[PDB]
Design a protein around this ligand. Sequence first.
Ligand code: HDD
Ligand code: HDD
Ligand code: HDD
Lengths: 83, 727, 309, 727
Amino acid sequence: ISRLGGPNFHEIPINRPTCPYHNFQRDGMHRMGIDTNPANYEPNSINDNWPRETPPGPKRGGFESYQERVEGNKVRERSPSFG
Amino acid sequence: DSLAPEDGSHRPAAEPTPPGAQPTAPGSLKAPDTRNEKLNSLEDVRKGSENYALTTNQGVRIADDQNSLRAGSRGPTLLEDFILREKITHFDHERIPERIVHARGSAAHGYFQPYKSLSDITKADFLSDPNKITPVFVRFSTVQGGAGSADTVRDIRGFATKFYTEEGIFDLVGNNTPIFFIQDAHKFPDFVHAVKPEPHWAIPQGQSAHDTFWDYVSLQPETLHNVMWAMSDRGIPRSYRTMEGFGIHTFRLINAEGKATFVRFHWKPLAGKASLVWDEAQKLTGRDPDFHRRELWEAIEAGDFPEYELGFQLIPEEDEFKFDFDLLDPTKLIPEELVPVQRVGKMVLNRNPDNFFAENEQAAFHPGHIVPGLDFTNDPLLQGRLFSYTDTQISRLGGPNFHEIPINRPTCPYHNFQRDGMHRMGIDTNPANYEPNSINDNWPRETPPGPKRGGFESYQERVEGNKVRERSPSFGEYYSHPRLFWLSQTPFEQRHIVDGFSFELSKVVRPYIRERVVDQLAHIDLTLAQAVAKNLGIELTDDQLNITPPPDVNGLKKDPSLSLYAIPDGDVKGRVVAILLNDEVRSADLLAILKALKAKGVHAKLLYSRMGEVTADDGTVLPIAATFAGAPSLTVDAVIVPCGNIADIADNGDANYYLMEAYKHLKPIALAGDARKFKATIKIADQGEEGIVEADSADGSFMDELLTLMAAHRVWSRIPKIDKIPA
Amino acid sequence: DSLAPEDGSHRPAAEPTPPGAQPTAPGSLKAPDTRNEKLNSLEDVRKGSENYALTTNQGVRIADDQNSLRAGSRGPTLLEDFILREKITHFDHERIPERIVHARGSAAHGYFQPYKSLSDITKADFLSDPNKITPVFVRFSTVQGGAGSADTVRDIRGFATKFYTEEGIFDLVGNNTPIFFIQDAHKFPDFVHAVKPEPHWAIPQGQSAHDTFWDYVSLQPETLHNVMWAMSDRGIPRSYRTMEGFGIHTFRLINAEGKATFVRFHWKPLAGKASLVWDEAQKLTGRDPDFHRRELWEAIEAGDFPEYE
Amino acid sequence: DSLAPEDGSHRPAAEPTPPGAQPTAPGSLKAPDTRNEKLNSLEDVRKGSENYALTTNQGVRIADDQNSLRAGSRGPTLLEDFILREKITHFDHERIPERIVHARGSAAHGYFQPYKSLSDITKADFLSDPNKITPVFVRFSTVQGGAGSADTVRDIRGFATKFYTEEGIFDLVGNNTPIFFIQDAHKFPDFVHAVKPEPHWAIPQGQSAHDTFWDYVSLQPETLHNVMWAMSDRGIPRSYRTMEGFGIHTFRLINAEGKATFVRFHWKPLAGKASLVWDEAQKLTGRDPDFHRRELWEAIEAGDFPEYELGFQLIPEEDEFKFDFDLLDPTKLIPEELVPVQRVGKMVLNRNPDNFFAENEQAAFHPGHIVPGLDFTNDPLLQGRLFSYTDTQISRLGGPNFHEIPINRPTCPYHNFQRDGMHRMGIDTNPANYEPNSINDNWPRETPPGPKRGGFESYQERVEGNKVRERSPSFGEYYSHPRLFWLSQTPFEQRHIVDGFSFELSKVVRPYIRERVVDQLAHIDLTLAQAVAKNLGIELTDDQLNITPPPDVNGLKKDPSLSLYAIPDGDVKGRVVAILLNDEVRSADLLAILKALKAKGVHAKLLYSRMGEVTADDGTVLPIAATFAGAPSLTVDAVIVPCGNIADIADNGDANYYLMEAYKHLKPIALAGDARKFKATIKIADQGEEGIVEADSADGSFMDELLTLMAAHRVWSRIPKIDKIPA
Ligand code: HDD
Ligand code: HDD
Ligand code: HDD
């Protein structure tokens, strides 16, 4: 945000994905992308909810975190195993 | 030079004066002896001006601040004019990004003091002794509009308090309604984009009355509870002094033993609760877009300090699952019938800023700014807010040194190993910029958590579960709070809610969105749903008429503390009355009028058809504050018309309209002697009407009645009668 | 999903429709067949939406855009939720500084064409041939108020036109009155500070009706001419379509022979001159603070294209 | 924890100490009693550390600064860890844009005082009385390299002085050569882009030895004069203390009567003029890239304050056109044989900063920052500079309030109607933010020009001409100044110039560029062009051999003030000597050596093949500063080898190489007793040679002879002898 002047650093040519990127994020300094979506929020009916979420799956699926089991108290503590 | 008037009338007296008696001024010039530790610590950056030479920022005296340097007096401007370039450069870069939300706000300095030590439930230093005075800086705001938008819009209001404690800044960043629209912070950009001006054309400003807002609401039923509050008169406060404040989220209090107590924060207005009515609010956005900001500033300048009582709803840790709603769900309120608000202390706002931009615009509040003795909870909205308020000031306030901006500086010590960053003010002399270090003997050093002056240690809450992007099933209930709120309102408050929904949905262009919202209202209450539907020309279906109402909340069918007006709590001090003058006022009426108002701390504004002065029957010269059109009834709480030469104003359309507008907006109207001829313009029966004070003269009896009406705020019984007034 | 209604009433017709008949829409969706060289050159950065998956800015598809990642469904939000942090980060930095002056403005795309070659008096390429059309982008504005201030205030109005000529950008940055308040640019910050919201309390918004403005005017008689215009009904135009526009300054036209001609620039409203009355203007700031922005947008959507000579 | 050593050896004594004796430290801790008005004014922002608790920036004490908050000690880090996020956030935004040019620089605080009042020729307050002390902040720099680039590169050096006067900041922003490369500011970006790292691959750093620079020079002959200076030993100063400083442009002095006098600013090093030799300079960028920064800091810590004499070349307005060159052409110097430098005052640099970033990196100097009594001229390079230095700190220092960053603040009063802007610190209480105003009685007010404390008014220079983008024809002469410089250098200086050009042109990949530069040199001097051509395997054509040399400069065929060394100005104080120890040093030699050096303020560094200690012949324990490889001969001015057990280091390759390197770089070498066995390493005849001090012991005249050699800086007569020597 300071180094590349804002949240649109993914629009700096070298950083751009070569795959599709569509979402409801708008504005910010030096915005290049001109969004034509009538909607800038979801859920929306005015654009029939596009762009839409995609269920996780074997290929071309949405990102879903591995459901790792978390068990412990809220601590600022180094694990003894790292000692 | 000597441009000031020789009589000295350009400078306001540095003593408390009523609204409009003097020109307003910077806080330190208006009330130089109002002090607190924070205000005193700002003295190193305050700059004067009287008797100083005009200079560049580099300290060079300027000889001619009227012209650019040019070759010949009609020649080209020269690049070597550094004085001109410095001045234009500074001007060219005056603006900073406004806040993403809550861009429109008004702020004041004050102080807080507890009523008793709360050491049994929290080790927070600022709550440890009734004699501990903590300086505060409070900013009230709207949410949707820009910094230049209007104050009396229909919206949620922000109520942010920065406490400068001896153990750190604690920011209590709340709103004027006890819940928020959404449950998880991940949807904030979605909700906010939906309510803000639509992206193609950036319309509308300061209004939720547009398709995208209601589109979102209709598809996200969790929003309905706060939507109900926004649609009620809670969305249009009379003033920041007459609204409630809530932290919304359940937080934790941590005591010296380490016991955690769940708490919800409340601010109770000691001036009582009061709101405008929609037509008055909307029209007031055009007549005075700065009405709340002005009201706040002038109340403080008059000594009508905004006073609030901090209140805590306290819930034992073992009571976590004893309600039929989840305590961590920010779309759910904790009814005061179930958990009473414990009165904890009082905050008084007693001084305006000196420079709005430097102190208000640049102030940075963040709910994550807590101190030992307080802690967070897992509320998924609060959790995500923690990331945002630090992040947003990197662009808004230009960097990570925003705590060095004067208004944001802690008044207690701050020392760490952080260095550099844009506009670094602090010059660190520590030999070390890392820890652990031996070269400065490890200073500054960590401090173990402890009863007082200890370091921050999080409450060791047990966390068990899988990494999931999942809403708790406990948050999946959307209609019982909205119903509870609805049933707790008076009949006229209910009417105003129906009118709020009806007006807003009429401005939604796609008819299907209106229908989908009406369907949601049918899940809350059939009467509400039917009333709104009828105003939209919509017919409830068979199925919609049979939707079973949601269950009561832990047996409650209502809670009067949710209504603005159900339980009397009016306060007339700081209110204002418009007095409509004529060219030969019956001085006896004004004397009685003004004496009685002054005994209750009610201000008056003398109005006429022109500026200047009029002379009363006995020769008293009366100075006019404004014209009828100039200071419309929208700006006052009541209207009094004294006797005298009524024929002077009887045919003044503006005078007649003043009374009709006030009448329509349920304001107390008092008519003395021949001023009773104005009864025909507002069609009042010969035998009178409750809400209209009328007498042969303005004696003490007439004034007590009017002041009684003012304490009740508005004449709600007049509602059925305004329908037939063309105003 | 099945969110849009089955009758398709959520989408505004892509054809000229009168004010209020359809929901307004982004220009390229509302009027897809309108084009100019500039509008065509913006096509490389226009982004659609229909039928695309919701992604992060790095192109990663999102599965659940309704929740943060937490340890348990009632647990703490995790720092590894990069999807949440990107989304909130972008949101957190959406605002840029508003313009120092003229922050409140409404704009539209269009085109310009000269009636005849003006090569005898200027070598400016965009005026060299009646057949040469120059795309434009025009922004109308007030002066004093913020970007969120009201449209029908009493104020001067800005009329800025960006000409995308074949020999460079030509910006004609004028106002709706033929003169300015002050004579020398060095006093611009003085004048603007006087008219803007006073520094202690930041009141009033979008209005010159306060002490510092009149103080400045009373001490600087050069301001009276433009103040006369502001106090007239010129200060409250009915619409950006019914006001005049002026470059104010005398500039020069240089022909191919090197001859200079002094020139003052004018815009004549082909819809004629028309203003509101003060009570209406002021009430309208409350009833519809976006009235001029809305009126301009809707006129274009209806085919009532704003035309200026 | 309490990590410092119990003997307190972690902390440097707060007293003057020689280089290497103690850990260096922040200025206010090393020399707390060294004060000035500016240093005292910085006390409001200086922050200590000792005995303070470690906190967040909001003042909250931290209990555990070793760990993030997680769910379980092996669990995921939680978003609610605001302590971690504040800390990483500040870290993440530490850097600010470096300066576009002169990004690499070292600074110090000091004071200036005039020798006599200059009231007859200037009304500048800081020059009005010999007892008026003006605080200064000086930054020396290279030009091309980034902030992390090396110090001893071949480049021009910047010499910027901020004078905190009573009538405003005056920044004298100069270089170490009396001319610049280009004439008009419009070409600054071209010249700078040509010298900086090439755009495709960003190579090379800190060097003009690349194609684009020499391409530009070859096409723009106006650059040749400063190129001659950069190719000479001027381009590789021994230290910022031993180089000259120049304002370059002709400015104006204005007196109280309104008379304008043309002035060129000079800084004379009171330590004398001294430079390295190229091989040494280049290798030193590798062995110690911070050599100049370090040397400056340690000189000040040792009490060897860098001292400079400000001098003025003054030229009456009537003599503007009396020279062969234009006074406003920045590529032309004013020969001191024509116009002597009149001594004006002394500047002493006596305290290092506390925090480099806060004081050095954020300091902003600009030549447009002048005060009443000074004025500009039409020099077209200066004219455009006035635009750049204010503009550039809008990004570098984040906005228009860069004058509020502590180091930049005037110490005199500054008041005006400028408001807001990012990071605004000053809280203005003026009711008015515009002038003329009546509401504050027009304060702050303009001030008429006058003899003292008056407003700034530009000198009324006559301007006459058409609006043109045209170089004055008087500027179209490019070879006489270069030739005058060349002819003023000693024979070894000329050789070094020839070597500089030859080395740099050998790094130009495109041969035609080398040829084109050679052709330009042939327009300056045939000897110079031939010697460079010979080193590049280029033959001059018959035409080139017949190019007529440029005319003398106003009759001068040389000016010895242009040479570093033609006129001896040696000063040994602050220089340093390497002493190569052995494991049984003759203590008597060491006592004589160290005391002689200390009596002249010359420092010593005791070197050995390992660290720790060695024991002398009498049991004296000798602390080792560094190893032979650890502190190479590049970092010292001379080398002394005492007697003792020479067989210990006789076959040490590093010890032998130490002497070979120092020998090659023309430094004085002194060998006592058996240390004379090292003569065979550097091939010294039995009889001895000028530049090598040798005797049976370090007694008698041994030290005086070595100090005489150090006073002459380098042994130039050894050049022919180092030609061979594999080192
Ligand atoms: C995750 C993002 C997020 C969410 C879920 C909320 N907010 Fe927030 N709000 C912000 C992100 C934010 C912000 C982007 O960080 C802002 C605007 C700029 C700033 O300084 O803070 C802010 C400003 C802001 C202000 C103005 C402070 C001032 O006057 O400067 C108040 C009173 C609140 N918010 C109150 C609320 C309430 C009580 C919330 C729900 C319970 C809420 N916010 C949810
Ligand atoms: C010396 C400074 C100065 C002066 C004397 C004026 N302005 Fe200006 N104006 C500004 C400095 C400025 C500005 C600071 O540079 C602005 C605001 C932000 C922007 O980009 O430009 C600008 C904006 C601005 C705009 C809005 C452009 C847009 O829509 O983005 C218009 C229409 C004008 N100006 C019109 C004028 C006219 C007709 C002027 C008098 C003849 C005038 N201004 C004097
Ligand atoms: C028009 C552009 C321009 C030109 C023609 C000059 N430079 Fe400059 N220089 C700048 C534009 C600049 C600059 C971009 O504005 C800089 C870099 C960052 C800064 O603050 O100032 C600066 C830095 C800068 C510094 C560093 C100050 C520091 O330590 O912060 C010195 C010593 C000089 N320059 C000296 C000179 C001299 C003696 C020049 C020729 C006579 C010259 N410059 C030409």
